[PDB]
Design an enzyme around this catalytic site. Sequence first.
Site, PDB file in Angstrom:
ATOM      1  N   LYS A 109       0.829  -1.204   0.000  1.00 14.75           N
ATOM      2  CA  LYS A 109       0.000   0.000   0.000  1.00 14.75           C
ATOM      3  C   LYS A 109       0.864   1.255   0.000  1.00 14.75           C
ATOM      4  CE  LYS A 109      -2.066  -2.826  -0.527  1.00 14.75           C
ATOM      5  NZ  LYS A 109      -2.108  -4.351  -0.485  1.00 14.75           N
ATOM      6  N   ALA A 153      -2.248 -12.778 -12.653  1.00  9.81           N
ATOM      7  CA  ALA A 153      -3.071 -11.566 -12.707  1.00  9.81           C
ATOM      8  C   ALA A 153      -4.079 -11.514 -11.571  1.00  9.81           C
ATOM      9  CB  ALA A 153      -3.767 -11.445 -14.054  1.00  9.81           C
ATOM     10  N   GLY A 154      -3.686 -11.971 -10.383  1.00 14.47           N
ATOM     11  CA  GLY A 154      -4.471 -11.818  -9.180  1.00 14.47           C
ATOM     12  C   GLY A 154      -4.120 -10.535  -8.460  1.00 14.47           C
ATOM     13  N   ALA A 177       4.000 -14.233  -9.189  1.00 16.73           N
ATOM     14  CA  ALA A 177       2.894 -13.872  -8.292  1.00 16.73           C
ATOM     15  C   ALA A 177       1.708 -14.806  -8.503  1.00 16.73           C
ATOM     16  CB  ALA A 177       2.513 -12.413  -8.521  1.00 16.73           C
ATOM     17  N   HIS A 231     -24.530  14.595   1.352  1.00 20.15           N
ATOM     18  CA  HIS A 231     -24.214  15.050   0.032  1.00 20.15           C
ATOM     19  C   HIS A 231     -23.294  16.258   0.118  1.00 20.15           C
ATOM     20  CE1 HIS A 231     -24.729  16.244  -4.170  1.00 20.15           C
ATOM     21  NE2 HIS A 231     -24.749  17.481  -3.715  1.00 20.15           N
TER      22      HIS A 231
HETATM   23  C1  LIG Z   1     -20.781  27.783  -0.291  1.00 22.93           C
HETATM   24  C2  LIG Z   1     -21.847  26.778   0.144  1.00 22.93           C
HETATM   25  C3  LIG Z   1     -21.365  25.487   0.332  1.00 22.93           C
HETATM   26  C4  LIG Z   1     -22.257  24.499   0.733  1.00 22.93           C
HETATM   27  N1  LIG Z   1     -21.742  23.153   0.910  1.00 22.93           N
HETATM   28  C5  LIG Z   1     -22.701  22.182   1.203  1.00 22.93           C
HETATM   29  C6  LIG Z   1     -22.244  20.798   1.299  1.00 22.93           C
HETATM   30  O1  LIG Z   1     -21.171  20.427   0.932  1.00 22.93           O
HETATM   31  N2  LIG Z   1     -23.227  19.852   1.646  1.00 22.93           N
HETATM   32  C7  LIG Z   1     -24.540  20.170   2.101  1.00 22.93           C
HETATM   33  O2  LIG Z   1     -25.265  19.334   2.493  1.00 22.93           O
HETATM   34  N3  LIG Z   1     -24.955  21.513   2.013  1.00 22.93           N
HETATM   35  C8  LIG Z   1     -24.013  22.464   1.578  1.00 22.93           C
HETATM   36  N4  LIG Z   1     -24.523  23.736   1.439  1.00 22.93           N
HETATM   37  C9  LIG Z   1     -25.948  24.024   1.772  1.00 22.93           C
HETATM   38  C10 LIG Z   1     -26.834  23.613   0.602  1.00 22.93           C
HETATM   39  O3  LIG Z   1     -26.399  24.368  -0.511  1.00 22.93           O
HETATM   40  C11 LIG Z   1     -28.316  23.852   0.933  1.00 22.93           C
HETATM   41  O4  LIG Z   1     -28.585  23.199   2.133  1.00 22.93           O
HETATM   42  C12 LIG Z   1     -29.208  23.315  -0.189  1.00 22.93           C
HETATM   43  O5  LIG Z   1     -28.792  23.847  -1.436  1.00 22.93           O
HETATM   44  C13 LIG Z   1     -30.680  23.585   0.116  1.00 22.93           C
HETATM   45  O6  LIG Z   1     -31.441  23.015  -0.919  1.00 22.93           O
HETATM   46  P1  LIG Z   1     -32.880  23.665  -1.242  1.00 22.93           P
HETATM   47  O7  LIG Z   1     -33.398  22.906  -2.432  1.00 22.93           O
HETATM   48  O8  LIG Z   1     -33.702  23.799  -0.025  1.00 22.93           O
HETATM   49  O9  LIG Z   1     -32.538  25.209  -1.642  1.00 22.93           O
HETATM   50  P2  LIG Z   1     -31.630  25.868  -2.815  1.00 22.93           P
HETATM   51  O10 LIG Z   1     -30.488  24.947  -3.161  1.00 22.93           O
HETATM   52  O11 LIG Z   1     -31.279  27.256  -2.317  1.00 22.93           O
HETATM   53  O12 LIG Z   1     -32.604  25.883  -4.106  1.00 22.93           O
HETATM   54  C14 LIG Z   1     -33.703  26.791  -4.112  1.00 22.93           C
HETATM   55  C15 LIG Z   1     -34.081  27.025  -5.573  1.00 22.93           C
HETATM   56  O13 LIG Z   1     -35.236  27.739  -5.571  1.00 22.93           O
HETATM   57  C16 LIG Z   1     -35.050  28.829  -6.677  1.00 22.93           C
HETATM   58  N5  LIG Z   1     -36.138  29.760  -6.358  1.00 22.93           N
HETATM   59  C17 LIG Z   1     -36.323  30.459  -5.232  1.00 22.93           C
HETATM   60  N6  LIG Z   1     -37.481  31.111  -5.281  1.00 22.93           N
HETATM   61  C18 LIG Z   1     -38.023  30.816  -6.475  1.00 22.93           C
HETATM   62  C19 LIG Z   1     -39.203  31.198  -7.030  1.00 22.93           C
HETATM   63  N7  LIG Z   1     -40.169  32.020  -6.396  1.00 22.93           N
HETATM   64  N8  LIG Z   1     -39.560  30.757  -8.220  1.00 22.93           N
HETATM   65  C20 LIG Z   1     -38.727  29.917  -8.896  1.00 22.93           C
HETATM   66  N9  LIG Z   1     -37.541  29.502  -8.340  1.00 22.93           N
HETATM   67  C21 LIG Z   1     -37.216  29.955  -7.127  1.00 22.93           C
HETATM   68  C22 LIG Z   1     -33.761  29.169  -6.505  1.00 22.93           C
HETATM   69  O14 LIG Z   1     -33.296  29.867  -7.711  1.00 22.93           O
HETATM   70  C23 LIG Z   1     -32.988  27.853  -6.277  1.00 22.93           C
HETATM   71  O15 LIG Z   1     -32.539  27.269  -7.435  1.00 22.93           O
HETATM   72  C24 LIG Z   1     -23.591  24.767   0.991  1.00 22.93           C
HETATM   73  C25 LIG Z   1     -24.070  26.043   0.759  1.00 22.93           C
HETATM   74  C26 LIG Z   1     -23.194  27.054   0.387  1.00 22.93           C
HETATM   75  C27 LIG Z   1     -23.679  28.479   0.162  1.00 22.93           C
HETATM   76  C1  LIG Z   2       2.478  -8.597  -1.447  1.00 15.99           C
HETATM   77  C2  LIG Z   2       1.353  -9.050  -0.511  1.00 15.99           C
HETATM   78  C3  LIG Z   2       0.372  -8.080  -0.329  1.00 15.99           C
HETATM   79  C4  LIG Z   2      -0.656  -8.368   0.543  1.00 15.99           C
HETATM   80  N1  LIG Z   2      -1.692  -7.351   0.696  1.00 15.99           N
HETATM   81  C5  LIG Z   2      -2.721  -7.646   1.611  1.00 15.99           C
HETATM   82  C6  LIG Z   2      -3.728  -6.632   1.881  1.00 15.99           C
HETATM   83  O1  LIG Z   2      -3.652  -5.517   1.458  1.00 15.99           O
HETATM   84  N2  LIG Z   2      -4.776  -6.995   2.791  1.00 15.99           N
HETATM   85  C7  LIG Z   2      -4.950  -8.311   3.386  1.00 15.99           C
HETATM   86  O2  LIG Z   2      -5.883  -8.598   4.037  1.00 15.99           O
HETATM   87  N3  LIG Z   2      -3.945  -9.299   3.092  1.00 15.99           N
HETATM   88  C8  LIG Z   2      -2.888  -8.925   2.215  1.00 15.99           C
HETATM   89  N4  LIG Z   2      -1.907  -9.924   2.055  1.00 15.99           N
HETATM   90  C9  LIG Z   2      -2.059 -11.253   2.727  1.00 15.99           C
HETATM   91  C10 LIG Z   2      -1.662 -11.126   4.206  1.00 15.99           C
HETATM   92  O3  LIG Z   2      -0.323 -10.741   4.199  1.00 15.99           O
HETATM   93  C11 LIG Z   2      -1.848 -12.462   4.929  1.00 15.99           C
HETATM   94  O4  LIG Z   2      -3.165 -12.866   4.700  1.00 15.99           O
HETATM   95  C12 LIG Z   2      -1.563 -12.314   6.410  1.00 15.99           C
HETATM   96  O5  LIG Z   2      -0.262 -11.829   6.591  1.00 15.99           O
HETATM   97  C13 LIG Z   2      -1.680 -13.695   7.072  1.00 15.99           C
HETATM   98  O6  LIG Z   2      -1.473 -13.488   8.444  1.00 15.99           O
HETATM   99  P1  LIG Z   2      -0.946 -14.762   9.306  1.00 15.99           P
HETATM  100  O7  LIG Z   2      -0.756 -14.225  10.696  1.00 15.99           O
HETATM  101  O8  LIG Z   2      -1.834 -15.927   9.108  1.00 15.99           O
HETATM  102  O9  LIG Z   2       0.460 -15.158   8.576  1.00 15.99           O
HETATM  103  P2  LIG Z   2       1.839 -14.373   8.293  1.00 15.99           P
HETATM  104  O10 LIG Z   2       1.601 -12.882   8.170  1.00 15.99           O
HETATM  105  O11 LIG Z   2       2.527 -15.023   7.118  1.00 15.99           O
HETATM  106  O12 LIG Z   2       2.674 -14.517   9.688  1.00 15.99           O
HETATM  107  C14 LIG Z   2       3.169 -15.828  10.048  1.00 15.99           C
HETATM  108  C15 LIG Z   2       4.340 -15.551  11.010  1.00 15.99           C
HETATM  109  O13 LIG Z   2       4.721 -16.764  11.509  1.00 15.99           O
HETATM  110  C16 LIG Z   2       6.302 -16.755  11.430  1.00 15.99           C
HETATM  111  N5  LIG Z   2       6.589 -18.190  11.571  1.00 15.99           N
HETATM  112  C17 LIG Z   2       6.228 -19.193  10.751  1.00 15.99           C
HETATM  113  N6  LIG Z   2       6.601 -20.380  11.282  1.00 15.99           N
HETATM  114  C18 LIG Z   2       7.160 -20.062  12.463  1.00 15.99           C
HETATM  115  C19 LIG Z   2       7.686 -20.881  13.396  1.00 15.99           C
HETATM  116  N7  LIG Z   2       7.707 -22.314  13.310  1.00 15.99           N
HETATM  117  N8  LIG Z   2       8.185 -20.396  14.513  1.00 15.99           N
HETATM  118  C20 LIG Z   2       8.192 -19.064  14.723  1.00 15.99           C
HETATM  119  N9  LIG Z   2       7.658 -18.224  13.796  1.00 15.99           N
HETATM  120  C21 LIG Z   2       7.157 -18.740  12.658  1.00 15.99           C
HETATM  121  C22 LIG Z   2       6.541 -16.117  10.299  1.00 15.99           C
HETATM  122  O14 LIG Z   2       7.944 -15.657  10.306  1.00 15.99           O
HETATM  123  C23 LIG Z   2       5.538 -14.938  10.253  1.00 15.99           C
HETATM  124  O15 LIG Z   2       6.032 -13.754  10.798  1.00 15.99           O
HETATM  125  C24 LIG Z   2      -0.750  -9.607   1.185  1.00 15.99           C
HETATM  126  C25 LIG Z   2       0.245 -10.559   1.016  1.00 15.99           C
HETATM  127  C26 LIG Z   2       1.302 -10.265   0.171  1.00 15.99           C
HETATM  128  C27 LIG Z   2       2.402 -11.298  -0.029  1.00 15.99           C
END
Ligand SMILES: Cc1cc2nc3c(=O)[nH]c(=O)nc-3n(C[C@H](O)[C@H](O)[C@H](O)COP(=O)(O)OP(=O)(O)OC[C@H]3O[C@@H](n4cnc5c(N)ncnc54)[C@H](O)[C@@H]3O)c2cc1C
Ligand SMILES: Cc1cc2nc3c(=O)[nH]c(=O)nc-3n(C[C@H](O)[C@H](O)[C@H](O)COP(=O)(O)OP(=O)(O)OC[C@H]3O[C@@H](n4cnc5c(N)ncnc54)[C@H](O)[C@@H]3O)c2cc1C
EC number: 1.8.1.4
Lengths: 474, 472
Positions: B56, B187-188, B274, B449
């Site tokens: 990773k 290709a795993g 692999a 959203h």
């Molecule tokens: C900078 C900014 C960032 C924001 N970021 C987020 C965010 O990330 N996530 C989130 O959840 N909220 C966010 N918000 C809040 C979000 O924008 C509002 O909660 C949401 O848009 C409200 O939806 P609504 O449909 O009630 O009103 P509005 O989105 O204000 O829509 C009202 C509509 O009615 C129209 N309208 C009004 N009166 C009339 C009329 N008499 N006749 C015809 N059309 C009319 C308007 O033109 C408008 O298109 C953000 C707001 C701002 C300002």
């Molecule tokens: C390149 C690669 C990428 C991977 N990416 C992921 C991923 O992103 N997510 C995921 O879930 N899995 C991933 N895996 C798989 C993951 O690594 C294994 O599933 C996990 O490590 C298994 O855990 P384990 O404890 O069973 O064995 P292991 O991690 O193999 O640990 C076994 C331990 O026992 C030791 N050991 C063995 N025999 C003895 C002994 N007799 N005495 C003392 N010590 C001993 C070993 O030295 C080792 O440290 C990846 C594997 C590889 C090779």
Amino acid sequence: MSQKFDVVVIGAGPGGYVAAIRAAQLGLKTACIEKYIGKEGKVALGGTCLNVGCIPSKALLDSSYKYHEAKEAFKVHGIEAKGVTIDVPAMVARKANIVKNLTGGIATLFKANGVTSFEGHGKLLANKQVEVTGLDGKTQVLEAENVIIASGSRPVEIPPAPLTDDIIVDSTGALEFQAVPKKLGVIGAGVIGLELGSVWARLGAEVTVLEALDKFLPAADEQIAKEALKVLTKQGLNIRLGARVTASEVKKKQVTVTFTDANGEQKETFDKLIVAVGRRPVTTDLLAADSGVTLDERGFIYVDDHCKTSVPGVFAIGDVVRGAMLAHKASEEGVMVAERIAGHKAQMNYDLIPSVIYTHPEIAWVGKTEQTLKAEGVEVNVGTFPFAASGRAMAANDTTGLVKVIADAKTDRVLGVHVIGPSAAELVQQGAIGMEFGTSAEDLGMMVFSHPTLSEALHEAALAVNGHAIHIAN
Amino acid sequence: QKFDVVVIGAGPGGYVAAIRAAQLGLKTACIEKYIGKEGKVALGGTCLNVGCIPSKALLDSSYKYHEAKEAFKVHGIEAKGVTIDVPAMVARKANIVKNLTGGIATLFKANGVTSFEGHGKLLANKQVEVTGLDGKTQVLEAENVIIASGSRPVEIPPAPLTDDIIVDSTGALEFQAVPKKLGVIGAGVIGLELGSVWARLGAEVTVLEALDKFLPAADEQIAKEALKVLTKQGLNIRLGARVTASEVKKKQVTVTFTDANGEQKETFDKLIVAVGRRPVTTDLLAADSGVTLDERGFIYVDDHCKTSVPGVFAIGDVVRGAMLAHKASEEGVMVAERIAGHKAQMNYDLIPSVIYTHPEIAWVGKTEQTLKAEGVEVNVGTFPFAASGRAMAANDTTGLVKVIADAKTDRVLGVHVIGPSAAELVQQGAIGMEFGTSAEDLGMMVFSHPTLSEALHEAALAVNGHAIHIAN
Ligand SMILES: Cc1cc2nc3c(=O)[nH]c(=O)nc-3n(C[C@H](O)[C@H](O)[C@H](O)COP(=O)(O)OP(=O)(O)OC[C@H]3O[C@@H](n4cnc5c(N)ncnc54)[C@H](O)[C@@H]3O)c2cc1C
Ligand SMILES: Cc1cc2nc3c(=O)[nH]c(=O)nc-3n(C[C@H](O)[C@H](O)[C@H](O)COP(=O)(O)OP(=O)(O)OC[C@H]3O[C@@H](n4cnc5c(N)ncnc54)[C@H](O)[C@@H]3O)c2cc1C
């Protein structure tokens, strides 16, 4: 019949466009009205989120992070990226093209589903009649069996910092800068301000974020917020808490802000100032005086737990009503309302709506914070696991942050999951899916999590709740 | 010399088993013989030293280089050039391995596990002979033994390891320069990962795979997309290609293989073998230990990893089941818990699989082709990352999510992903499946959203024909 619909949706943002698609899927004859003009001079669907919000901000966050990593975090891999630069116009143009494609995609979905689009401004009259003023100024009236109001939100304006020239901007202008602001001020240390400040800081802006509240990210878990403040400050966001803006002055293509902090009156000068204090619901010319639909004292449309207004057959969803102002909240309300119009007893869960802040490290959470549970008097067990102990994160060269799981101390039920670090939102979604099924911490601990993956940090944090994580002391 | 638990091997199986046993109050020893880069015994087994983590690390470094070379301009990012120093890349990996192997020793010390350095051999009556690095022996009296001796690469007669030219996965993680032409046999997962590392850095890579079918354990739709994408990335994957001979001359190697068109030859600067992995039992069992092996060399165990001898268990790659690190570790936890008196069990049905190519490939549960062969009627839903707003912002739109559900009960039976954050999205599916989720259950949840997770949400909705963001 050209003017009669089972469902008329006002607005095509996350709420309205999803409601319209779902209604059409359920066999309802559906219209959706939208007025917003996109960059090509034509109506663009997708609302705030697609055009000036979620998607544009994430596009700039992703581009700016890739530049940042190339400049600052390549040498450890053996990678030499000589004279790396980023061109701001090109970065912004990529974002614009993404917006164009996705807004077109909504129109494609509307066509595939049989949603009729109207271009113009919709106004609700009495008795579910909707007046549409087209782009040529002409009006027509649609006769609706049901109306879904989804008019969304806009930025809050403040008297000390009115939008001015291209110097004092809101989030929409901040997503359109054509050059890096050398000194960037941000009013508001919430999600929007932190994201926008991060974009430009990565490209060299010297950023100050002025936040009137004493507490950083008060809705986030305090431990997460504390780490976030530390990390973001180190990244160059000069986040000043307890700092209240009182005035601004624009001269010589710069803006001087006056603000009050613990030590008194302060001044700071910026090339650009982003006003990111909050968002307000949009009801401008939306409701005729005879519509019957009422507003609360904060200007939101009043609705019940199923998004029904005071008028039968009239619903309101998304940012114009109570609840979390988030895109996935608006869309799920749209689905619920459409399903209910179709006769289904659809019910939205408001307790498991996640939050995401797309800084890097990303911040996300679902459920309750430690401080909320303490105020509620609920005894909890907490488990955490740091990404510094994650083999996957080490391989990724990205070890900042932690996962936190909070469980009921008596029942072991998971009550909140909070993450700062790589893939925070995806790990929080894992938690949210578990919470939908009532997961305990032990349930998550007893599952097989792939190794090596970032998800293992959630597995270990869940084990740590009950004192038996493998890969950290308990 | 008396222990409640003696563990043979300190890989993912053994070292986790040892920690868990110690946590449960059992007096625990762990024996390991592998010598790491500093000349001392290194814990962590195949996975930490020559497997999961090193691969990773090189995948992540090589991908960052690749993206800088091939996918920066669209963001407005330019450079006068981008190069990667292979010795430095490999040294980063070596330092990560050193830190993590040290971390296992730290965990052993904090938990009170006693380490022995040397080769462990199970004798009769649960006595374990430890042969130290100097050849001296001692016997440990074990109330319980956990055998976790792991695996090693398969060797094939037509391509014996040779000098620095024909290598296995261990050598492939240690190249100090990019091979100009690189051959890979198999290709795993391992061959595709190693081939990806070196292709990204400029090697011309051929992968020779004897089977006609690519990734036969993966869902056919995912595998077909994977073959297309990886071929485009420069892995020249030749199916139905059976290696019959090799010849090394002048620091190059010519491989003879047969394909549909007859006998072929291809010459490489380096060749990676692999083809697979095999269990290790070398000098592990005395003739009268009582422990039996199957015909493929695995230790025979039941579903609780208990051998034919009471109090003797075997876990991980030396026993049946998926040869994966998380399988080994969870078997280690089960065995330790059972020794402590708990009726602990292992779930063999939801073990995910991950291939750390880019795009990443991951899955859990059953493939469409398996379910068809079993006669189970299914509904399938898919969603492409080309329709994900988050993925568009990320400039990474290759791939799809696939959810398979029972047509009668709507229970999710398999989740398969190729694309960004595949493993995290599959884990979401696995968590749902642990709770018995239906596709509609996932569809009714709130997904943030914009996130890559939404692709799983949409695929789940598509199962029953009502995704929002693609036509149904
Ligand atoms: C900078 C900014 C960032 C924001 N970021 C987020 C965010 O990330 N996530 C989130 O959840 N909220 C966010 N918000 C809040 C979000 O924008 C509002 O909660 C949401 O848009 C409200 O939806 P609504 O449909 O009630 O009103 P509005 O989105 O204000 O829509 C009202 C509509 O009615 C129209 N309208 C009004 N009166 C009339 C009329 N008499 N006749 C015809 N059309 C009319 C308007 O033109 C408008 O298109 C953000 C707001 C701002 C300002
Ligand atoms: C390149 C690669 C990428 C991977 N990416 C992921 C991923 O992103 N997510 C995921 O879930 N899995 C991933 N895996 C798989 C993951 O690594 C294994 O599933 C996990 O490590 C298994 O855990 P384990 O404890 O069973 O064995 P292991 O991690 O193999 O640990 C076994 C331990 O026992 C030791 N050991 C063995 N025999 C003895 C002994 N007799 N005495 C003392 N010590 C001993 C070993 O030295 C080792 O440290 C990846 C594997 C590889 C090779």
